[PDB]
Write a structure and sequence with these properties.
It is a single chain. The protein is α/β, with parallel strands linked by helices. The protein has one domain (1-228): TIM Barrel (Alpha-Beta Barrel). It is built from eleven helices and ten strands. It has helices at residues 23-32, 43-47, 54-62, 77-85, 95-99, 101-111, 145-152, 169-177, 192-196, 210-213, 219-226, and strands at 2-9, 12-14, 38-42, 68-71, 90-93, 116-124, 130-133, 159-164, 182-186, 205-208. An eight-stranded parallel barrel has the order 1-3-4-5-6-8-9-10, surrounded by five helices. The chain is globular, with a radius of gyration of 17 Å. Its EC number is 5.3.1.16. This is 1-(5-phosphoribosyl)-5-[(5-phosphoribosylamino)methylideneamino] imidazole-4-carboxamide isomerase. Pathway: Amino-acid biosynthesis; L-histidine biosynthesis; L-histidine from 5-phospho-alpha-D-ribose 1-diphosphate: step 4/9. It is found in: Cytoplasm.
Length: 228
């Protein structure tokens, strides 16, 4: 499916570039065009978990009729629980999934794999290895995408979000290798042709953010393309 995305700072939709303070009508129109899932990044919370935008997230989730996956500096069991309590369908786990796998495996056991998405940044190194990194501005963490995925398979891993931060063959490879996992792709979507390029790869979800904000195409057009 297409997964439209918004990044939020203090109630503001951002890319830094300001897109106004109307995230709810934006999300509602995404849903209205047929989106089955939405993606939110809480940039405020990612900078200070004490300022996690729980009240706003509550309102946004209550305001649409589709599951929303939400991430942004989720570090603790308590972060996960508070997001789910606010009505989030799935919590997106980034750096913590690389940093403390045994802890996060406990979270799978507690919350269920349907409630968790692992967001992994990947850069292809000199040798062609898919290296995991916790962010675009930090060095590789010393573990490959395959190795980290295989760490979580025994607790029923089902959802992985994969962002290529080095830049299709990448997604073809990992999706084929782990057909029991629903991979999402993130980044690199500049126009409708980019969505088409992902169609035969095995990727289950396509995160689309900035291209929607820039008016390159609509959610409806993205879905029609995806569905061929």
């Amino acid at each position: 499916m297409i997964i439209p995305a918004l990044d939020l700072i203090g109630g503001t939709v951002v890319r830094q570039r300001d897109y106004g303070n109307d995230p709810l009508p934006r999300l509602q129109d995404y849903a209205a065009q047929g989106a089955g899932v939405l993606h939110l990044v809480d940039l405020t919370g990612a900078k200070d978990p004490a300022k996690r935008q729980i009240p706003l997230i509550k309102t946004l989730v209550a305001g649409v009729n589709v599951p929303v996956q939400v991430g942004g500096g989720v570090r603790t069991e308590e972060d996960v629980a508070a997001l789910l309590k606010a009505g989030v369908a799935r919590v997106v786990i980034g750096s913590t999934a690389v940093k403390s796998p045994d802890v996060v495996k406990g979270w799978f056991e507690r919350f269920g794999a349907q409630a968790l998405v692992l967001a992994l940044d990947v850069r292809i190194d000199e040798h062609g290895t898919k290296q995991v990194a916790v962010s675009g501005w930090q060095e590789n963490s010393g573990v490959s995408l395959e190795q980290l995925v295989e760490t979580y398979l025994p607790v029923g891993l089902k959802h992985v979000l994969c962002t290529d931060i080095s830049r299709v063959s990448l997604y073809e490879e990992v999706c084929a290798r782990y057909p029991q996992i629903a991979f999402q792709s993130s980044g690199g979507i500049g126009d409708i042709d980019d969505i088409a390029a992902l169609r035969g790869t095995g990727v289950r979800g396509v995160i689309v953010g900035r291209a929607l904000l820039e008016g390159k195409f609509t959610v409806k057009e993205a879905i029609q393309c995806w569905q061929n």
